[PDB]
């Protein structure tokens, strides 16, 4: 494992700033001194397929413009492309191209690291169980990962026990998980774009975090999966066309107690939102449930008001009117019948689902409200689309 | 066909969170349905799944690990007790996969060993409810 | 009086109709079944709007089953032309049939909402018996009047036709139009215009349907939710008080019975 | 053959029925009005059309033939027709051909205007699947109607008065459309850990409205058994109607 001083860097400026010329290199490399190294676009630092290619142990390092290729794959020994030690505080990894079968950017124990503008193409043949993480962050406080381009890794931007950090504007394509969150209290992520992913956003056991403006285009079976998130905030997300592969849920709220879910857009999936029985009484108001074949799945008999401050959500199948010309509808909207939960409670009713007697039972509930189980209604639904900006 | 707790593979995803089960410590529940076995990344994620009303009426046997006869970081498939007759401890500082840490036992005295060793309380299977799972996870991963 | 002597026939002829006694027991076993389901869910403004919806489907049905063949069933049966050669008028053999079939609906709904009240005072403990008797006293003297509306509708379409097989086609048409078509045309007028056709004319179209005035009378004290109402949510925007809503129910009898007498006078 | 000579009567008498032409017109508007509000707003719309034709094609079949046998006995022509060179089989089979081609035309105005409203209001419907999914739909809607036609001959031959024939034809329509599946649904909610789940698909074969929907939703059974079980509902009930008609 050689070092970065064992290469041939021509210094542009004598403030520990270096510039690697065009030409290939070989093997792992190690930064031990605070060097603000740049690279020419022909700086193909190609390792041989083993070890972490650019290990970093020194603070205040501006690695910029490098192009790393073909590092190791031992995920237990953390074969990364850019390994950043706990002593390497405030590292900047700016505008880099990476292609290799392990971790792209593995940091751990670091503070105020900035991972900006990189393009990390992961793999093609490994079974998405040993591809390694795109941007792995392991218990970092202060991180700033912005405007990257992660493609074909395993579970995208993994986040483990990292407290305060932003994920702004990065594109994540063809992975199993888009963004994975594990115990990340007081996190934040803005404007990320996810395409063709087996779960667009994993929100697991992380409290107090802000999920805003993110996009999920044509993901598989789970648009945004939230497990055990409390006091969070889900504002302005655009989840589109979650196809099956699960049957396809644009938002799957599982055991999330308190969180504000406003201004979202759940579009053209099989299930618009899945609300489990344990996750109840949270502020869900102002979303847009358009084009989904079934809007809410809520298997309970507990009533669930879905409109805070008298404003509810826009529903595409809302066959209502508005007499006094405000934005709100006049009649309440129940998204689920009693027969829409007999199909979920007993799957053998799927054979009987086209029967006229079932179609009688849909009309008997609209005529006789004693048999209506208390569902997932919202008084005052919206009449127009509130997310007129999210379609762009 | 409901009589067989199947063994875990490395390529075994959870039913709820969907992630890889054998990358985690703690006991891992699973549910044999006799039409298809579905597995869980933690016992608290199985008990969160069991208390949903689609699965209250569903006739399926629940199997968890025996942490009285296994090491807590890498549990073998092996001895896998019935989850209705177990003794879950709660409120310990142990790091489970998803929910609160619910170490499952079968003999109630080894369950009483870990309860006093971490400040927890033993409780049976029927005492588990969704008011308790969300309360215990807030005491573990909160504040 | 001759009006009572011909009412005593229809009281003793309608009670031998086996099709009446099936669907008037169906009204009794459903008003118990609704009130039993309304007692186990202990709510109250939904069990009033569901009982009033039950009498919307059945009190027009019992009224049209009785009196669709009242005039034309006697005309082609030959016994109408005989009856005019008795010391009678055409006004006495219509008002007498209205009294005779009207006391059946006064007894078919006193059985129905009577046994529905006994499945509340003996099932759900601690209800206000003054409020229970008042609400089901308002249910009895307003679902009878709804029954007398469709009784007087049936005399219009029995005097107009001249064959009893065509009278059953019109009586099925009146039951379909006023019960479960007029609430859907008003719904489709409100859905396709998104409530912007007329914000002030549209509540007055509820008065052109006596089944909708019937729902507006019994749902006075119990507003509650909105999806229990549906297209009865325009009834809050009707500025008429409750006493005029009784008078528009009596006016649906008196215009459609005076029309039934003027049709029968030129039979 | 006099099975056709008595069928030409039932065509000419059935097509002037004002009660039938009101329902067959109402079937054709609602088959367009479901197809208009189901494509612009194709297996997703043929399922809502299957629930419509399960309501009305038993009702069209029972309106034609509830007074086929007992309506001729009250009319006096039944005693006249048996003195002609005609068996009792040829009266029943000839009424079954004559009333059968009426509701074989009532799906050609019903779905002939519904498939026209799909082939001209989707623009990219992939019509090679249309002429096979509606070809399986128009054939199976006649066979559903031919069961209830043969059910109507059973209740016509049994009764002695025209008023109780309509009282039984309403009872057959309530039981086989929306009481048999509601008592299927009711048992499941009341008992879910005792009733066999596997048993219920087999128990769907005791209902010709249910076998009608299962060949429009394409499942432990194959397709070819359901066609031979729907035809067995015709062939048993026509043989049952012939055995009742021979005992007048």
């Amino acid at each position: 494992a050689p070092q970065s001083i064992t290469t041939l860097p021509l210094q542009p400026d004598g403030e520990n700033r270096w510039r690697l010329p065009a030409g290939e290199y070989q093997g792992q490399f190690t930064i031990e001194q605070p060097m603000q190294l740049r690279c020419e676009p022909g700086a193909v630092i190609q390792s041989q397929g083993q070890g972490s290619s650019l290990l970093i142990s020194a603070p205040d390092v501006l690695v910029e413009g490098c192009t790393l290729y073909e590092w190791g794959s031992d995920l237990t020994a953390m074969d990364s492309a850019v390994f950043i030690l706990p002593a390497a505080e405030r590292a900047q990894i700016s505008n880099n191209r990476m292609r290799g079968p392990g971790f792209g950017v593995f940091v751990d124990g670091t503070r105020d690291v900035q991972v900006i503008g990189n393009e990390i193409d992961g793999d093609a043949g490994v079974r998405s169980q040993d591809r390694g993480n795109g941007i792995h962050l392991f218990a970092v406080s202060g991180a700033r990962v912005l405007h990257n381009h992660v493609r074909n890794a395993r579970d995208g931007i993994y986040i483990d026990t990292s407290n305060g950090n932003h994920l702004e504007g990065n594109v994540i394509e063809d992975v199993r998980y888009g963004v994975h969150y594990m115990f990340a209290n007081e996190n934040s992520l803005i404007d990320n774009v996810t395409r063709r992913t087996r779960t667009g956003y994993a929100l697991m056991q992380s409290r107090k975090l802000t999920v805003t403006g993110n996009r999920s285009e044509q993901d598989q079976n789970y648009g945004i999966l939230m497990n055990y998130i409390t006091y969070s905030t889900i504002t302005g997300n655009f989840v589109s066309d979650v196809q099956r592969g699960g049957e396809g849920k644009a938002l799957f709220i599982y055991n999330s107690l308190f969180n504000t879910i406003e201004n979202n857009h759940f579009e053209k999936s099989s299930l618009g939102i899945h609300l489990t029985a344990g996750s109840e009484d949270n502020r869900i108001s102002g979303n847009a449930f358009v084009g989904n074949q079934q809007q809410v799945k809520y298997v309970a008999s507990r009533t669930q008001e879905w409109s805070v401050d008298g404003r509810g959500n826009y529903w595409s199948d809302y066959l209502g009117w508005d007499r006094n010309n405000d934005g709100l509808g006049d009649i309440a909207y129940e998204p689920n019948d009693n027969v829409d939960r007999l199909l979920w409670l007993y799957p053998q009713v799927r054979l009987l689902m086209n029967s006229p007697s079932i179609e009688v039972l849909r009309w008997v509930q609209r005529a006789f409200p004693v048999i209506k189980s208390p569902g997932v209604q919202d008084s005052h639904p919206l009449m127009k689309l509130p997310t007129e900006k999210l379609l762009t | 066909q409901s009589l067989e707790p199947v063994a875990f593979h490395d390529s075994d995803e959870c039913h709820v969170c969907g992630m890889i089960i054998t990358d985690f410590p703690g006991p891992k529940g699973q549910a044999v349905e006799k039409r298809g076995v579905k597995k869980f990344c933690s016992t608290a994620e199985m008990l969160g799944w069991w208390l949903q009303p689609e699965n209250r009426l569903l006739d399926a046997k629940l199997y968890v690990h025996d942490m009285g006869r296994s090491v807590w970081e890498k549990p073998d498939d092996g001895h896998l007790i019935d989850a209705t007759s177990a003794y879950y401890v709660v409120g310990t500082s142990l790091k489970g996969a998803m929910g609160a840490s619910l170490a499952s036992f079968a003999e109630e005295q080894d369950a009483k060993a870990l309860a006093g060793m971490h400040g927890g309380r033993v409780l049976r299977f029927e005492e588990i409810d969704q008011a308790l799972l969300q309360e215990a996870a807030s005491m573990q991963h909160g504040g | 009086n001759q009006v009572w002597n011909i009412a005593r026939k229809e009281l003793s002829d309608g009670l031998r109709n086996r099709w009446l006694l099936a669907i008037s027991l169906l009204f009794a076993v459903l008003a118990v079944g609704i009130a039993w389901l309304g007692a186990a869910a202990s709510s109250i403004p939904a069990t009033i709007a569901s009982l009033a919806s039950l009498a919307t489907f059945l009190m027009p049905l019992i009224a049209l089953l009785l009196a669709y063949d009242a005039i034309v069933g006697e005309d082609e049966g030959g016994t109408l032309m005989l009856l005019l050669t008795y010391p009678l008028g055409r006004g006495q053999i219509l008002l007498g049939k209205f009294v005779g079939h009207g006391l059946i609906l006064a007894l078919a709904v006193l059985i129905g909402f009577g046994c529905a009240a006994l499945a509340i005072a003996l099932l759900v403990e601690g209800v206000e018996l003054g409020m229970l008797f008042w609400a089901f006293g308002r249910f009895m003297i307003s679902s009878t009047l709804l029954g007398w509306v469709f009784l007087a509708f049936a005399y219009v379409l029995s005097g107009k036709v001249n064959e009893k097989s065509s009278a059953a086609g019109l009586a099925l048409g009146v039951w379909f139009l006023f019960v479960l078509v007029f609430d859907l045309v008003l719904l489709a007028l409100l859905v396709l215009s998104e409530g912007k056709f007329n914000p002030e004319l549209l509540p007055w179209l509820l008065l052109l349907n006596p089944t909708d005035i019937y729902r507006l009378i019994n749902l006075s004290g119990f507003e509650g939710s909105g999806s229990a109402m549906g297209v009865l949510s325009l009834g809050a925007d009707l500025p008429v008080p409750a006493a005029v809503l009784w008078l528009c129910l009596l006016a649906w009898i008196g215009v459609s019975l005076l029309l039934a007498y003027a049709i029968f006078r030129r039979r | 053959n006099q099975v056709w000579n008595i069928a030409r009567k039932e065509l000419s008498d059935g097509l002037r029925n004002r009660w039938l032409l009101a329902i067959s017109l109402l079937f054709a508007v609602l088959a367009v009005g479901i197809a208009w509000l189901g494509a612009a707003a194709i297996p997703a719309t043929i399922a809502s059309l299957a629930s419509l034709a399960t309501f009305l094609m038993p009702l069209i079949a029972l309106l034609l033939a509830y007074d086929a046998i007992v309506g001729e006995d009250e009319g006096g022509t039944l005693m006249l027709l048996l003195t002609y060179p005609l068996g009792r089989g040829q009266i029943l089979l000839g009424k079954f051909v004559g009333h059968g081609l009426i509701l074989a035309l009532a799906v050609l105005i019903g779905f002939g205007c519904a498939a026209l409203a799909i082939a001209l209001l989707v623009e990219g419907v992939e019509l090679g699947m249309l002429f096979w999914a509606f070809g399986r739909f128009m054939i199976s809607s006649t066979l559903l109607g031919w069961v209830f036609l043969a059910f109507a001959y059973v209740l016509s031959g049994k009764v002695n008065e025209k008023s109780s024939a309509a009282g039984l034809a309403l009872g057959v329509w309530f039981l086989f459309v929306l009481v048999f599946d509601l008592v299927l649904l009711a048992l499941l909610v009341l008992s879910e850990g005792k009733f066999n789940p596997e048993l219920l698909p087999w128990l769907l074969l005791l209902n010709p409205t249910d076998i009608y929907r299962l060949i429009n939703l394409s499942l432990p059974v194959p397709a070819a058994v359901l066609w031979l079980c729907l035809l067995a509902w015709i062939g048993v009930s026509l043989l049952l109607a012939y055995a009742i008609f021979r005992r007048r």
């Binding site: - | - | 002829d13 016994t79 009856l83 008795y86 | -």
Partner: protein, 307 residues
């Protein structure tokens, strides 16, 4: 003078379906009204019952107006076919009509035994034959001593013992002083019981009077047939000497159509030579008289088998 129709020419739709019938009926006669082409038979029937208003003329039933309540308790009307009320019983149908007509309720038990219906009393009218409903329909017509019956074909669907007993029940009421009108279309058989026929055709009342007058005002041949013997050398000629065609159709059926002006000498021809067995002087019946007056107004004789 029970029924006094005078000058009535009922018009409706400017069609004039009745014209100038002057039908005075006595207090004990049994009148018969028979109509073919003309619609007068039913309109005049209505006109007496009071359920029609006489345009251009006056109808005086029982000396008073026809729609007064004081005379409508004294009328009795048997209509054509009355399937009354199929769910009511026999007594309850007749007690219903007894309350309307003001008759005493003790008459119901003595009319369901007078008419043969006490075995079928307290049985539903849907379980009645057509003959039993005509029996019940007559029973409300005799309700509360009617001074004017008006029967519109009372003997249809009825077994022949009750039909003969009905006219004996009719003949009891003629002696009691109640005028009866028999509007019928079964003219052979009713001619033995009526007193005066009234054949009306094309609205105009063609002929009225007794049966002896209608044969006097219409020259019709009497159809004398003489069984014993037909045989041919002198029985063909001894009657044709004065113009009586001795036409026969069988072994002995010589129906000599006479003129009713030589009944002394033809029977002296019959009894003077040749022995007979059973002479049957068949007078021109009400069927033959009806087809004379019908043909005299508008009708043309149909062909050999062409109606």
């Amino acid at each position: 003078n029970a029924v006094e129709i005078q000058g009535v020419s009922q018009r409706y739709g400017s069609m004039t379906v009745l014209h100038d019938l002057n039908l005075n009926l006595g207090e004990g006669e049994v009148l018969g009204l028979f109509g073919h082409n003309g619609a007068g038979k039913t309109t005049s029937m209505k006109l007496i019952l009071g359920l029609l208003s006489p345009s251009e003329g006056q109808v005086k039933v029982l000396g008073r107006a026809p729609n007064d309540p004081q005379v409508r308790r004294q009328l009795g009307y048997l209509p054509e076919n009355v399937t009354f009320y199929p769910q009511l019983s026999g007594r309850e149908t007749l007690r219903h009509f007894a309350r309307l007509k003001g008759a005493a309720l003790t008459q119901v038990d003595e009319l369901l035994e007078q008419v043969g219906l006490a075995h079928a009393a307290d049985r539903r009218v849907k379980t009645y034959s057509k003959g039993m409903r005509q029996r019940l329909g007559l029973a409300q017509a005799l309700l509360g001593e009617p001074r004017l019956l008006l029967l519109d074909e009372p003997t249809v669907g009825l077994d022949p013992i009750a039909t003969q007993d009905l006219y004996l029940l009719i003949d009891r009421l003629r002696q009691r002083g109640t005028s009866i009108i028999l509007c019928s279309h079964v003219l052979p058989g009713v001619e033995a019981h009526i007193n005066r026929a009234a054949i009306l055709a094309k609205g105009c009342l063609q002929a009225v009077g007794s049966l002896s007058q209608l044969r006097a005002e219409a020259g019709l041949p009497v159809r004398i047939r003489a069984s014993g013997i037909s045989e041919r050398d002198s029985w063909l000629q001894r009657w044709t000497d004065a113009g009586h065609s001795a036409r026969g159709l069988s072994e002995s059926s010589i129906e000599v159509v006479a003129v009713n002006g030589h009944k002394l000498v033809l029977l002296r021809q019959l009894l003077g030579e040749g022995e007979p067995e059973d002479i049957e002087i068949h007078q021109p019946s009400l069927e033959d008289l009806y087809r004379y007056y019908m043909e005299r107004a508008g009708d043309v004789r149909a062909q050999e088998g062409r109606l």
